[PDB]
Symmetry: C3
Subunit: 91 residues, 3 copies
């Protein structure tokens, strides 16, 4: 059977790659995945972070700090969803 | 905290401009595209991700792209829900 | 529309061929793969997405890739539902 984990998505400009990774890591996430992305909002010059955490509270802390620091001045969207992972694994 | 719909459309790279036009014309605030490869029934393809506050616009955009390109082009599509801010 | 299951596997690019074989030999109708980078416990990784008509098929694919590769390679895997 399975354990609930939270998946935090942050899509932002590529220039924020180092700062946002450091925020994810200093908040205690076990890792993150980055994908190269393009898009339009309101080539592949955006980055999509996906951060998995078994703590909904850790996902909120990361999202809150990235939104406070960079949402005003940088193209940034963010959202959260749940996924199921194997009980034996650690997120 | 609001519930939002995520529409994924995986199709051939060559449809990039035409599908982006369908998404923008239906009134979606934007979209994300990623490079992809894969196998199916019929790097090569593009994955669209479109977030829409209403399920109706998600379905609307899906209807259009499917009608116009499904039977002629490599093309899969699905919808999930996510939690966003505002 | 109907509920389907989406299996994600994130692993090293060196396992591409061998994970795709597990996927197709298990009876999945297909798979998608995206280049990825990241850190755990640049774009050296790949993310599989496998849509399956049943949970059990997603579970059997995940059980096999994990049993073969989780201990010696980078292997993140999780499952969610979508409507198609
Ligand atoms: N409705 C949407 N659906 C999916 N992705 C979006 C949407 N709106 C914005 N984005 C993504 O967020 C990026 C930045 O948004 P913005 O800050 O509005 O420029 C875009 O380039 C897209 O990658
Ligand atoms: N079961 C599946 N799971 C994930 N992606 C799929 C699946 N079937 C097809 N695809 C994707 O859709 C593309 C085109 O599908 P097709 O029209 O069946 O050739 C493939 O190259 C894959 O990227
Ligand atoms: N908590 C996480 N959230 C998102 N992606 C992760 C997470 N942990 C690991 N990853 C991804 O999985 C890859 C392998 O992780 P590892 O198995 O710890 O080397 C990493 O390089 C990331 O792409
Ligand atoms: Cl940065
Ligand atoms: Mg600035
Ligand atoms: Mg797992
Ligand atoms: Mg799982
Ligand atoms: Mg997919
Ligand atoms: Mg795992």
């Amino acid at each position: 059977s399975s354990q609930q984990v939270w998946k935090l998505v942050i899509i932002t400009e590529e220039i924020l790659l180092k700062k946002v990774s450091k925020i994810i890591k200093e908040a205690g996430a076990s890792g993150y995945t980055v994908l190269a992305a393009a898009g339009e909002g309101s080539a592949y010059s955006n980055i999509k972070f996906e951060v998995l955490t078994a703590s909904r509270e850790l996902a909120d802390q990361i999202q809150d700090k990235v939104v406070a620091k960079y949402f005003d001045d940088y193209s940034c969207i963010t959202y959260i969803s749940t996924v199921e992972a194997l009980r034996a694994h650690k997120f």
